[PDB]
Amino acid sequence: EVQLVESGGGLVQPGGSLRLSCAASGFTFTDYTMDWVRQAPGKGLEWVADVNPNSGGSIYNQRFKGRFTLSVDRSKNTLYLQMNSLRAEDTAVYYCARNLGPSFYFDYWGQGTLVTVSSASTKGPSVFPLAPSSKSTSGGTAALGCLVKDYFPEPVTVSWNSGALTSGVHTFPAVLQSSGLYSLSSVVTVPSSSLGTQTYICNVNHKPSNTKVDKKVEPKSC
Amino acid sequence: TQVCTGTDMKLRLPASPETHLDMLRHLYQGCQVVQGNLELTYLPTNASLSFLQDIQEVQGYVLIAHNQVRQVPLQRLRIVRGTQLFEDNYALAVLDNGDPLSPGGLRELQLRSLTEILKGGVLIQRNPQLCYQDTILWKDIFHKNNQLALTLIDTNRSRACHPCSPMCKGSRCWGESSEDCQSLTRTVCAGGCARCKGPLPTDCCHEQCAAGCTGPKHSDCLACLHFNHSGICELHCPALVTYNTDTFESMPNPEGRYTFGASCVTACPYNYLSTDVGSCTLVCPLHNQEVTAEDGTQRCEKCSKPCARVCYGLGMEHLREVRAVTSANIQEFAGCKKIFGSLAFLPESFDGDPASNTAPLQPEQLQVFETLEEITGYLYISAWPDSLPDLSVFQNLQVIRGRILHNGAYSLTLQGLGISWLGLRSLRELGSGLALIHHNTHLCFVHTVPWDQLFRNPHQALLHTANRPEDECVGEGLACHQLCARGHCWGPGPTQCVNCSQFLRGQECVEECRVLQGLPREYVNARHCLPCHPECQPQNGSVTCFGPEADQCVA
Amino acid sequence: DIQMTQSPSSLSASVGDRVTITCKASQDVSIGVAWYQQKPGKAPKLLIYSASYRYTGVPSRFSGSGSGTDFTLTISSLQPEDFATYYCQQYYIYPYTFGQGTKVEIKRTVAAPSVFIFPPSDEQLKSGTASVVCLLNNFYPREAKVQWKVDNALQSGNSQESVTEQDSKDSTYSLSSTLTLSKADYEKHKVYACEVTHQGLSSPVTKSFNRGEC
Ligand SMILES: *[C@@H]1O[C@H](CO)[C@@H](O[C@@H]2O[C@H](CO)[C@@H](O)[C@H](O)[C@H]2NC(C)=O)[C@H](O)[C@H]1NC(C)=O
Ligand SMILES: *[C@H]1O[C@H](CO)[C@@H](O[C@@H]2O[C@H](CO)[C@@H](O)[C@H](O)[C@H]2NC(C)=O)[C@H](O)[C@H]1NC(C)=O
Ligand SMILES: *[C@@H]1O[C@H](CO)[C@@H](O)[C@H](O)[C@H]1NC(C)=O
């Protein structure tokens, strides 16, 4: 099986430097050129560059002349994309792909590493439960959940009751606030005939924060 | 000739022991860089291994195992790269080198130039007469970047060791001798230096060097870390193409080279294929294709259209893991003129496998191979239907390339058959690797093949034993047909000549064409009998036609 | 620099339909076009190369056609997995550029959202700001107007919309106009409520919540 694995993504301050790796297997590495293609959140695919393992030479997108640099280490079938003077517009998923015919279309694409360029200091999500109202029935159905405001950066994996509840879960995709911090609202639709019996706990997991703020969601005093 | 291909047999024991040392001699005789693995196994007590005294570099791993020789003379071995590792872990492996219960067995490692192990570790176990291996500073040999730099060493012994030469600074030595002191190259360097030739900062090696140096330049390396660009050590090879940097349009670069092993190369060596991307390989990359370019050389060009379909053999694509030709896969080769891969006929081919309902391959089914002209891997026949006295289903096989070799050594293997002659009457070239023909009891017409002419490099040979003795064959009245030039043939009959003495009518050697006194009257075109149009009036003791068409007839 | 322009931007088909996407090169690129498929979270897969040639193992229904400027992708009959995003890319000429993309989306019978509203938690009200939601649940299609109104008057410029990806089973969306404001502006008005316009609804409805007793 051919495989490629990007690693080395993260959060950098504007101007700062960063380096991404792409390790490869399942094929003769020295027989193909390899490429970086990036994808800014919600947008499409911009090609970055094409490094050759034999020559060590890259063919790069003019947009990046003198900021992004490419390197190969054929001893470990690994590419390296070195970004300097990083800015907002660079914030994206960075796929590493195989230049097929050394024409410029690509077959196997890696999972892709995400790079986030922002001044915002790493701040853990504060979880506030969304407790249902008294007139919250459509005929016998209610909804609840946990909202994770003011976190940074992406993402947070929210789950429910440790792992046994997935039926009806709607983890709303976040939107970046003016604060430069993240906010969402994870909601679940569960039968209204049993609210004061089953303890609903949400399992919040922020990776750059090391936080795990679990919150029980109980009815309101109305 | 400095560069050679090593073996891939591991601890498997030699299929023909009588020619095992001879195989090794032919392989490594006067070779300095060993692409692949140096596997020295099953060498008897007396074996002269003088032929190894020229190896500087082993690309893969070194396996010295199951030997009774007291000494293997690898004193000039400097670097082992560990591209592949024994047991996926060891760059060097020395195992069970004792007597199988004056005593035989390896005594000293004597690896006095081994200064660099790039990848993988060292395994030394069960060598009852071996001394001084617990003496070496192994940390020094492993490169700074060797991520599997580990040791597993056994010091079980059946003899008392003597100390190192008093001349050795520390406990360190590769043997009893003074010229055996371990020379250090990593642990004793000034500053960050990866390798050096002494304690001083000026004694430091170039960053691109690999085993140490004779001075500070990149032309003073004992070994190249990455590539050897015509004497200078570098990280990459000069691009095949020069770029604009604004337009990114490319002129061809006359200085450009291809990567072959650990050296930049003007053009890929004989059996290999150059690549649009700047490399030398044995399998064209995807969306590329093998083409016989405007020389005669093979080359990997891009396919505009989808690449044309190709017959894959064993060890290739969907037959990557398949051990032998069976009734389950034989039809797959139907019509194939060239097989990308190899074909192996084993006993399990012809006695079936009950287990997973696979019918015994019936002999008439072998007729599929009658269109076959080329094999890129190897041919291996350890079984063949008794009713067939020759390999004449391969009748039209012209080349076996040997881009893949069996056990990493042999391109043609015929063992245990009882065919009476070969009949491979079209085989003109064994591209690389050895031919091994042993234990075919009724086999004749072996000495009649000019193997000499099939080969393409000095390391090739026909190793052969335990066949029918040639004097026994002639003595049974067996011979090349009178019409075979220089006495050479692949079997009985005028069909079997290596080069036809007179004229070719079909694949048949004939004394005379049918020019003046024949049934279907014929013309001669460069030593070939060719018929006229069936409607040309035959002439009484005269030329009937000048060519094949109707305008060339006499009436 | 070369533009590949894809049409339409999004499209709604049902399973079993034929689906055609156009991609228009700004400049003659002979047959140097490939086609990619991509799903949320996943990486691109190559489907067509050389404008018209199936990559290994790509199912037969996928076909690429055309040459020069106008290029076309046609899924002969849609299958459940096909619902995804399709990009085209010219590679004929440097620098290599991709189309802006096409979302193929699963069409269903028209539905209506079960409007909700949610109050800020007890632990949040002592921070300095407040958040009130509007969760529209399980509706089709995506087209929906949302505008908040505090007590009497409407509002604009403090809410942001957030929509789920299509549901895997019942194939609907969901929205959430999270309304954010200061605590000092919170302890100044009684009843908040949003109004929901939907092609499925006959009336823009409202759902109530009271600050006085909750
Ligand atoms: C790198 O390549 C050069 C040239 O191929 C090697 O230099 C040769 O060394 C051999 C002995 O092995 C001599 O026969 C020649 O005199 C040399 N050739 C020339 C003209 O340079 C060199 O040994 C190789 N290895 C390294 C690491 O330098
Ligand atoms: C080295 O020592 C080993 C133990 O590590 C010896 O082990 C056994 O010794 C007896 C008597 O000599 C033998 O008959 C057994 O075969 C040995 N067992 C095994 C499993 O190795 C060993 O003999 C010593 N030397 C050798 C021959 O390598
Ligand atoms: C056959 O004869 C020709 C020379 O006329 C030569 O090319 C070849 O080496 C000979 N033997 C073989 C290998 O067929």
Q: What CATH number does residue B326 fall under? A: 3.80.20.20
Query: In chain A, where does the domain assigned CATH 2.60.40.10 lie?
Result: 1-119, 120-219
Tally Cβ neighbours within 10 Å of residue B466.
Answer: 16
Q: Which of C127, C119, C102 is closest to C19 using CA atoms?
A: C102
Dist. CA B300–CA C181, nearest whole Å: 66
Our answer on whether the CB atom of B254 is closer than 6 Å to any ligand 1 atom is no
Note whether B145 contacts A: Cβ–Cβ < 8 A: yes
Partners of C66 in the β-ladder: C71
Q: What CATH number does residue B283 fall under? A: 2.10.220.10
Task: Tell me the CATH architecture of domain A120-219.
Answer: Sandwich (2.60)
Mutate to test the pocket of ligand 3, among B427, B499, B500, B504 (most ligand atoms within 8 A of CB): B499
CATH of A1-119, one of 3.90.79.10, 3.90.1300.10, 3.40.50.300, 2.60.40.10: 2.60.40.10
Same domain, B547 and B489: no
Dist. CA B377–CA B399, nearest whole Å: 10
Note whether A55 contacts B279, CB cutoff 8 Å. Answer: no
- 3-state SS of B297-354? CEEEEECCCCCCCCEECECCHHHCCCCCCCCCCHHHHCCCCEEECEEEECHHHHCCEC
Q: Which two tokens stand for residue C170?
A: 């019942």
Dist. CA B211–CA C44, nearest whole Å: 44
What is the count of structural domains for chain B? 4
> In B103-199, which ranges are continuous DSSP H helix?
138-141
CA B213–ligand 1 middle distance (angstroms):
14
CA distance B379 to chain A (A): 25
CA B232–ligand 1 middle distance (angstroms):
9
Dist. CA B320–CA B316, nearest whole Å: 4
DSSP character at residue A43: S
Torsion over CA: B32, B37, B42, B45 (sign): positive
Contacts with A68 from chain C: Cβ below 8 Å: none
Residue with tokens 């950066």: A153
Our answer on whether the CB atom of B223 is closer than 6 Å to any ligand 1 atom is yes
Our answer on whether the CB atom of B103 is closer than 6 Å to any ligand 2 atom is no
Residue with tokens 């003769």: A28
Q: Which two tokens stand for residue C142?
A: 């995506």
Same domain, B26 and B53: yes
Residue with tokens 């990009």: C87
Q: Which of B361, B417, B436 is closest to B15 using CA atoms?
A: B436
- Using an 8 Å Cβ cutoff, are A201 and A161 in contact? yes
Dist. CA C107–CA C117, nearest whole Å: 28
Which ligand 1 atom lies nearest to the CA of residue B210? 27
From residue B403, how far is each of B37, B406, B430 by CA, in Å? 16, 10, 10
Dist. CA B47–CA B22, nearest whole Å: 10
CA B499–ligand 3 middle distance (angstroms):
6
Note whether A54 contacts B145, CB cutoff 8 Å. Answer: no
Our answer on whether the CB atom of B228 is closer than 6 Å to any ligand 1 atom is yes
Within the 260-279 window of chain B, which residues sit less than 8 Å (CB to CB) from chain A? Answer: 275-279
Q: Which two tokens stand for residue B310?
A: 């190709």
Dist. CA C60–CA C76, nearest whole Å: 9
Dist. CA B151–CA B154, nearest whole Å: 10
DSSP character at residue B409: T
- Using an 8 Å Cβ cutoff, are C37 and C84 in contact? yes
- Closest partner residue to B248 (CB to CB) among C50, C53, C94 is C94
Same domain, B387 and B323: yes
Contacts with C50 from chain B: Cβ below 8 Å: 304-305
Same domain, B364 and B400: yes
Q: Which of A31, A143, A73 is closest to B276 using CA atoms?
A: A31
Q: Which of B150, B105, B162, B141 is closest to B123 using CA atoms?
A: B150
Q: Which of B138, B130, B182, B136 is closest to B161 using CA atoms?
A: B130
Q: Which of B55, A100, B325, B211 is closest to C49 using CA atoms?
A: A100
Backbone angles phi, psi at A39, to 5 degrees: -150, 100
DSSP character at residue A72: E
Dist. CA B449–CA B471, nearest whole Å: 16
**Letter for the amino acid at C27?**
Q
Residue with tokens 């690129």: C29
Q: Spell out where B66-207 has E strands.
A: 79-80, 90-95, 116-117, 121-125, 151-153
Dist. CA B491–CA B395, nearest whole Å: 11
What are the strands of the beta sheet with B227-229, ordered from one edge?
B232-234, B227-229, B263-265, B258-260
Pairing of strands A3-7, A18-25: antiparallel
The residues, any chain, with a CB within 8 Å of residue B31's CB and separated by 6 or more, are: B1, B2, B3, B4, B54, B55, B459
Note whether A105 contacts C34, CB cutoff 8 Å. Answer: yes
Range of the domain at B526: 502-555
Backbone angles phi, psi at B51, to 5 degrees: -65, -10
What are the strands of the beta sheet with B434-438, ordered from one edge?
B343-345, B379-381, B410-415, B434-438, B462-465
Dist. CA B44–CA B26, nearest whole Å: 17
Dist. CA A35–CA B102, nearest whole Å: 62
- Closest partner residue to A143 (CB to CB) among C97, C120, C137 is C137
Write b or e for each residue in A53-66: b if 16 or more Cβ atoms lie within 10 A of its Cβ, otherwise e: bbbbbbbbbeebee
Pairing of strands B38-41, B62-65: parallel
Tally Cβ neighbours within 10 Å of residue B428.
Answer: 11
3-state helix vs strand vs coil in chain B, percent to 5: 10, 25, 65
Dist. CA B167–CA B174, nearest whole Å: 13
Q: Which of C115, C124, C104, C141 is closest to C205 using CA atoms?
A: C115
Domain boundary among B267, B286, B306: B306
Residue B303, classified by CB atoms within 10 Å of its CB into exposed (0-12), middle (13-18) or buried (19+), is middle
Which ligand 2 atom lies nearest to the CA of residue B128? 28
Same domain, B427 and B322: yes
Residue C147, classified by CB atoms within 10 Å of its CB into exposed (0-12), middle (13-18) or buried (19+), is middle
Domain boundary among B148, B178, B194: B194
CATH homologous superfamily of domain C1-108?
A: Immunoglobulins (2.60.40.10)
Note whether A187 contacts C49, CB cutoff 8 Å. Answer: no
CA distance B250 to chain A (A): 11
Same CATH topology for C1-108 and C109-211: the answer is yes
Note whether B239 contacts A33, CB cutoff 8 Å. Answer: no
Size of interface A-B (CB pairs under 8 A): 57
In this structure, chain A runs to a length of: 222
Q: Which two tokens stand for residue A10?
A: 């993260």
DSSP for B425-488 reads: TT--EE-SSEEEEE--TT--SSTTS-GGGT--STT--EEEESS--HHHHHTTS----TTBGGG-
Domain boundary among B466, B485, B501: B501
CA distance C162 to chain A (A): 7
CA B504–ligand 3 middle distance (angstroms):
15
Same domain, B297 and B312: no
DSSP character at residue B392: T
Domain ranges of chain C: 1-108, 109-211
Highest CATH level, class, for C109-211: mainly beta
Backbone angles phi, psi at B273, to 5 degrees: -120, 125
CA distance C119 to chain A (A): 7
- Using an 8 Å Cβ cutoff, are B414 and B385 in contact? no
Mutate to test the pocket of ligand 1, among B3, B115, B209, B228 (most ligand atoms within 8 A of CB): B228
Task: Report resolution (Å) to 1 decimal.
Answer: 3.2
- Using an 8 Å Cβ cutoff, are B422 and B447 in contact? no
Mutate to test the pocket of ligand 1, among B230, B237, B260 (most ligand atoms within 8 A of CB): B230
Pairing of strands B288-292, B298-302: antiparallel
Tell which residues of chain B come right before a gap with C–N over 2.5 A: 101
- Using an 8 Å Cβ cutoff, are C166 and C108 in contact? no
